[PDB]
Design an enzyme around this catalytic site. Structure first.
Site, PDB file in Angstrom:
ATOM      1  N   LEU A  13      46.642  26.709  40.849  1.00  0.00           N
ATOM      2  CA  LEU A  13      46.071  28.179  40.995  1.00  0.00           C
ATOM      3  C   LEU A  13      44.635  28.210  40.444  1.00  0.00           C
ATOM      4  O   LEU A  13      43.769  28.977  40.864  1.00  0.00           O
ATOM      5  CB  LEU A  13      46.765  29.330  40.834  1.00  0.00           C
ATOM      6  N   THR A  15      42.556  27.707  36.336  1.00  0.00           N
ATOM      7  CA  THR A  15      42.692  27.532  35.074  1.00  0.00           C
ATOM      8  C   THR A  15      41.930  28.936  34.380  1.00  0.00           C
ATOM      9  O   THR A  15      41.037  29.455  34.992  1.00  0.00           O
ATOM     10  CB  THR A  15      41.727  26.273  34.575  1.00  0.00           C
ATOM     11  N   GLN A  17      41.913  31.252  30.534  1.00  0.00           N
ATOM     12  CA  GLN A  17      42.082  31.270  28.767  1.00  0.00           C
ATOM     13  C   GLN A  17      43.003  30.433  28.131  1.00  0.00           C
ATOM     14  O   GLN A  17      42.787  29.797  27.216  1.00  0.00           O
ATOM     15  CB  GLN A  17      42.001  32.491  28.382  1.00  0.00           C
ATOM     16  N   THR A  79      55.157  35.067  36.062  1.00  0.00           N
ATOM     17  CA  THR A  79      54.706  36.482  36.632  1.00  0.00           C
ATOM     18  C   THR A  79      54.990  36.609  38.252  1.00  0.00           C
ATOM     19  O   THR A  79      55.026  35.651  38.801  1.00  0.00           O
ATOM     20  CB  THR A  79      53.485  36.988  36.531  1.00  0.00           C
ATOM     21  N   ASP A 126      40.468  43.711  27.900  1.00  0.00           N
ATOM     22  CA  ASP A 126      39.298  43.056  28.853  1.00  0.00           C
ATOM     23  C   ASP A 126      39.568  43.498  30.286  1.00  0.00           C
ATOM     24  O   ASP A 126      39.655  42.457  31.243  1.00  0.00           O
ATOM     25  CB  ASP A 126      40.042  41.359  28.526  1.00  0.00           C
ATOM     26  N   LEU A 147      46.838  40.782  26.537  1.00  0.00           N
ATOM     27  CA  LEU A 147      46.892  39.213  25.959  1.00  0.00           C
ATOM     28  C   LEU A 147      45.649  38.758  25.226  1.00  0.00           C
ATOM     29  O   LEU A 147      45.712  37.616  24.520  1.00  0.00           O
ATOM     30  CB  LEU A 147      47.183  38.239  27.248  1.00  0.00           C
TER      31      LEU A 147
HETATM   32  C1  LIG Z   1      45.215  32.638  45.464  1.00  0.00           C
HETATM   33  N1  LIG Z   1      46.142  33.487  44.389  1.00  0.00           N
HETATM   34  C2  LIG Z   1      46.052  33.371  43.107  1.00  0.00           C
HETATM   35  O1  LIG Z   1      45.158  32.575  42.490  1.00  0.00           O
HETATM   36  N2  LIG Z   1      46.877  34.303  42.411  1.00  0.00           N
HETATM   37  C3  LIG Z   1      46.851  34.159  40.814  1.00  0.00           C
HETATM   38  C4  LIG Z   1      46.202  33.635  40.096  1.00  0.00           C
HETATM   39  C5  LIG Z   1      46.475  33.583  38.607  1.00  0.00           C
HETATM   40  C6  LIG Z   1      45.459  33.168  37.817  1.00  0.00           C
HETATM   41  C7  LIG Z   1      45.185  31.928  38.002  1.00  0.00           C
HETATM   42  C8  LIG Z   1      44.256  30.987  37.071  1.00  0.00           C
HETATM   43  C9  LIG Z   1      43.547  31.858  35.873  1.00  0.00           C
HETATM   44  C10 LIG Z   1      44.098  32.910  35.719  1.00  0.00           C
HETATM   45  N3  LIG Z   1      43.690  33.594  34.356  1.00  0.00           N
HETATM   46  C11 LIG Z   1      42.545  34.424  34.445  1.00  0.00           C
HETATM   47  N4  LIG Z   1      41.964  35.151  33.522  1.00  0.00           N
HETATM   48  C12 LIG Z   1      42.685  35.241  32.330  1.00  0.00           C
HETATM   49  C13 LIG Z   1      42.339  36.124  31.229  1.00  0.00           C
HETATM   50  C14 LIG Z   1      43.064  35.961  30.139  1.00  0.00           C
HETATM   51  C15 LIG Z   1      42.527  36.945  29.008  1.00  0.00           C
HETATM   52  C16 LIG Z   1      43.393  37.122  27.688  1.00  0.00           C
HETATM   53  C17 LIG Z   1      41.152  36.352  28.338  1.00  0.00           C
HETATM   54  C18 LIG Z   1      42.171  38.279  29.410  1.00  0.00           C
HETATM   55  C19 LIG Z   1      44.163  35.312  29.817  1.00  0.00           C
HETATM   56  C20 LIG Z   1      44.717  34.367  30.801  1.00  0.00           C
HETATM   57  C21 LIG Z   1      44.117  34.310  32.287  1.00  0.00           C
HETATM   58  C22 LIG Z   1      44.448  33.684  33.398  1.00  0.00           C
HETATM   59  O2  LIG Z   1      45.629  33.313  33.280  1.00  0.00           O
HETATM   60  C23 LIG Z   1      45.020  33.784  36.546  1.00  0.00           C
HETATM   61  C24 LIG Z   1      45.646  35.108  36.096  1.00  0.00           C
HETATM   62  C25 LIG Z   1      47.592  34.536  38.362  1.00  0.00           C
HETATM   63  N5  LIG Z   1      48.413  35.044  39.144  1.00  0.00           N
HETATM   64  C26 LIG Z   1      49.442  35.946  38.781  1.00  0.00           C
HETATM   65  C27 LIG Z   1      48.303  35.042  40.354  1.00  0.00           C
HETATM   66  O3  LIG Z   1      49.112  35.424  41.341  1.00  0.00           O
END
Ligand SMILES: CNC(=O)Nc1cc(-c2cccc(-n3cnc4cc(C(C)(C)C)ccc4c3=O)c2C)cn(C)c1=O
Length: 263
Positions: A13, A15, A17, A79, A126, A147
């Protein structure tokens, strides 16, 4: 605690943090996203204790935590899966050709999630369009609340770092590290501005340093063309110089419902 034998990894999906995030299936049936926590990126023991409290946060407009895998490295965070990805990129796609009522509904979705968090005295820290996700029905949910407390990267956690969310922070966070319910309220007003601007960067012609200065002088984001006077009053009320004069999420929700009825 999820058994990793019940997970399959299907596609990448992107990358964030804490490193790579994958789409897969849980128990051969349920769509999930799975964060694979990169070594050195997270305060893991602390997160593991908090995961218990976080398991108890549940609301239709918050991304639902399903579980964690912590008896292994890297650890996994499992999740709910959001088919349409982050709100920021979704806003930036002109094909959606959103009506303004759809933009206000996105603000309401986020406000509902934040009113729930506020009622639990739980800060996001954030909040921004990049940290909201959109499901297959076009519903927006707030992601990764709480987080930031476990991020190890100094460029994110320091106010003067390159990854700190400067443009979503109120003056007292940037000047004094004064985090509160009212700093999430400030960020929410910036998020409404992102939504009505169809994903423009806030303060798009300024640097982070120049943004901190513009806001210390009492100046604010301009009204997006698609925002009515009433919608601009709501986002602008989130940016009062005095934190105690900014509304609660409960007040903002009432204000947004009033505008929906009016407009
Ligand atoms: C096409 N559908 C999707 O891509 N669906 C989804 C994409 C992501 C996804 C993919 C890549 C990166 C991140 N991501 C982005 N920002 C973040 C920010 C933080 C903080 C602590 C800096 C706030 C921590 C982790 C992340 C993080 O894992 C997410 C949420 C997560 N989920 C549940 C989906 O359904």
């Amino acid at each position: 605690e999820i058994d990793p034998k019940d997970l399959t990894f299907l596609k990448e999906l992107g990358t964030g943090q804490f490193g790579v995030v994958k789409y897969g299936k849980w128990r051969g049936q349920y769509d999930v996203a799975i964060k694979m926590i990169k070594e050195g990126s997270m305060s893991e023991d602390e997160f593991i204790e908090e995961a218990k409290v976080m398991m108890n946060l549940s609301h239709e407009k918050l991304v639902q935590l399903y579980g964690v895998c912590t008896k292994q490295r890297p650890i996994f965070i499992i999740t709910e899966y959001m088919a349409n990805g982050c709100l920021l990129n979704y806003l930036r796609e002109a094909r959606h050709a959103f009506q303004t009522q759809q933009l206000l509904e996105m603000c309401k979705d986020v406000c509902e999630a934040m009113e729930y968090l506020e009622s639990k005295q739980f800060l996001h820290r954030d909040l921004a369009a990049r940290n909201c996700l959109v499901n297959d029905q076009g519903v927006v949910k707030v992601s990764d609340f709480g987080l930031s407390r476990y991020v190890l990267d100094d460029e994110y956690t320091s106010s003067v770092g390159s990854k700190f969310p400067v443009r979503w922070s109120p003056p007292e966070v940037l000047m004094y590290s004064k985090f509160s319910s009212k700093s999430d309220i400030w960020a929410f007003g910036v998020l409404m501005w992102e939504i009505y601007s169809l994903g423009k960067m806030p303060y798009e012609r300024f640097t982070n340093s120049e943004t901190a200065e513009h806001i210390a002088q009492g100046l604010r984001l301009y009204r997006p063309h698609l925002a009515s006077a009433a919608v601009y009053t709501i986002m602008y009320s989130c940016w009062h110089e005095k934190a105690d004069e900014r509304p609660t999420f409960k007040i903002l929700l009432s204000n947004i419902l009033d505008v929906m009825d009016e407009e």
